[PDB]
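[job 0412] stage=fold_complex status=start
inputs:
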Amino acid sequence: SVTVKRIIDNTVIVPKLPANEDPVEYPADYFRKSKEIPLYINTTKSLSDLRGYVYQGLKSGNVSIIHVNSYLYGALKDIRGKLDKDWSSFGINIGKAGDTIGIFDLVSLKALDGVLPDGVSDASRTSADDKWLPLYLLGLYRVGRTQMPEYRKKLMDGLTNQCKMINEQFEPLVPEGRDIFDVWGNDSNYTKIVAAVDMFFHMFKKHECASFRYGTIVSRFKDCAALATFGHLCKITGMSTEDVTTWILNREVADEMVQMMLPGQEIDKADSYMPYLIDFGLSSKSPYWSVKNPAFHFWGQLTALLLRSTRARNARQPDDIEYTSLTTAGLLYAYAVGSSADLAQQFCVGDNKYTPDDSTGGLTTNAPPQGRDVVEWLGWFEDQNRKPTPDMMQYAKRAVMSLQGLREKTIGKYAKSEFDK
Amino acid sequence: SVTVKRIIDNTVIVPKLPANEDPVEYPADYFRKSKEIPLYINTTKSLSDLRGYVYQGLKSGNVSIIHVNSYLYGALKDIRGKLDKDWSSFGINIGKAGDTIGIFDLVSLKALDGVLPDGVSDASRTSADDKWLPLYLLGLYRVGRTQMPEYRKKLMDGLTNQCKMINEQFEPLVPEGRDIFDVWGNDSNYTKIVAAVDMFFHMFKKHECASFRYGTIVSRFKDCAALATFGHLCKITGMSTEDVTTWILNREVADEMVQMMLPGQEIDKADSYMPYLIDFGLSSKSPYWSVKNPAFHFWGQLTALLLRSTRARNARQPDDIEYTSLTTAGLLYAYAVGSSADLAQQFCVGDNKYTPDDSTGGLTTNAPPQGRDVVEWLGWFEDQNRKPTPDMMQYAKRAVMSLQGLREKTIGKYAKSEFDK
Amino acid sequence: QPDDIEYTSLTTAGLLYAYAVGSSADLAQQFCVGDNKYTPDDSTGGLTTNAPP
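[job 0412] stage=fold_complex status=done
writing structure:
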């Protein structure tokens, strides 16, 4: 399986690929080399002075991100919370049981020389800072990282959360307004504050200032789509993680699952730095990136869609994967779940249904297994000469037909194109 | 089969064809003649004067390409990184382990011309220099290499990178101001700087100025589609590079496969000169060019399309090849992969699916083989009188019948015209 | 399309030839890994009679 030759000549030929190896970065590796998350923010100035730069800056659509970050650090500086138990993530002792700390558990550093942005300021601005303005700024990050006209849907979210505080005020321009949010995400330090806010209030959910977390929720598990897909697949099939894993039927998907489930990364932990590995700067290429798990993304979503999911309808269709093989496996899994409903009873009145009697091949040797055991189904499928039965094709036909208005380059579109013949 | 006579006259006719000698040039051959790459930056005017020439030149009608190249040299002159290991390529030592090296560690010379085109300048420009302007100038290579109204996306996202420091700025004219950089890709010095940038930052992926690649990326593997086509065919089928090679069933494809696999061309190397063999001017006719491998291009893409690829849809259809024979070969390969899904158990909990030692191939007289073994399928195919079966023709039909919006002279349009009449 | 030629006779010839290469792909193995397919076992068509070469 190494030496190839052309038959007519009998000469060795070595098959070669351009080969691009770009590896993932686990969160634990960051803290192997550094014990702090640096936040570069130009201090100086004053809360009242920075409030004027921002308030006026937003109204004109030219405010500096440096000013925004400086204001955000000032207004959120005094917010504190008391810990019931010790708080530790990747060896960092954030706090003990008893004592208090603020939102900035990470170590802050001070930015460069004189500020290039010179002016645009409101002199007489009231101390209504902490209340509503930081909510607004952090809320623009969420409105920022959408591209479809769902803007107005999520931009009203912000306004509604600000209305719970004071008078109704919309600040940016209509067409040009969108442009001054897109860069904000691309700022490393704005991005960190967002993640720090989200993490802090995830610990303190019952805190009064928990409303800040509305624009910043979209930071938790950013680029960790692979972990959500695994979760959704458990819920839609109703099988535990263990069982779902035994139903992986392709090598590429198995590789991706072991990459996903590397131990010591605090994935199932309640309050970890992990969910913000991209925003905190712990990773540049996430192991839970959906593009870094192409086969599992396709297999997971395609199976879930055939089991009547709505999330999978619009999921991206990856390139450079085994379309044909991954579908067959995905279809077989979906057919096994959808056929085998197995509905035991849960409540009774002295009158029970004894069930573990009579379970064999109902339609002679043609009948499918009664349950969801992958070994049973592999046996049955290999009896079917390893090609989908006219019943299985009809099952998927029904799962995709009567699906309406599908996007280009999509799981849904693929699925309907493939099965709705 | 050498001599040809006409039966009526017994005379000899000698069939002749016009010579067709346009031989491919390999990256290894260049460094056997010369041990350097000549880059001609004209004068050393001054960074300040040059910055003024291009800022205005861009903003108005046109700027001189000389002025761009001169400025681009000056703007990228001081950028450097430090390497962990030795960086060598085709017998050239760029730097031993631990050196600090610049972008132009690739031999600079001076152009013999008198700088006459010098007109139109903005003396006011200062700090807004290396930060973004070289990126803008580099970007226009990527934007200019498209003729389809897709450059709207490419210019739009080109601006996003500039916004990641100031001050939104769109500089050239919208309609006529597109052709001014459509010529840049034909200046052998400009394309060399582009390749120099991309090769430098492909090594130093962690540099601050790594964003300068959002433009120069289309230089890497330019006219090396034949290598990508092969890799894409591996990833879509799920077969190894060796196994794909064994599924070549045409002679013309083999010659092309032999062509692109020559022992010492640094194909599978991390950071080489090879990918930039056109833009560095190492070759005037690449061996990995789509056009120079017409049969493999056709066969390879067609097989992918039938295996549900979306990239293959719009791939160009070459002239002057065995269409009928290549298509049967491609149909057979695609069919064998689709009918025989990989499907094996990956994880277990004590309960294993045993399967080995199964002899009978489905049916007594004529039945499709269980694996992906070429010889097993060739023997099976001769038993069908070498004429594609109804199920095979149906397999090809289903995969092409749902394709919408197919462009002229593409392989996708061809496929649907043959398998979905 | 030229005129003053024999359309009918040239057509048959053109189709016979195109049919001969279309229905006969002549696929053959090119590369191997210690496992070779030999084509020439027994040369006879599909149907006992009138099965094309």
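[job 0412] summary: DSSP finds 16 helices and eight strands in chain A.
[job 0412] exit 0
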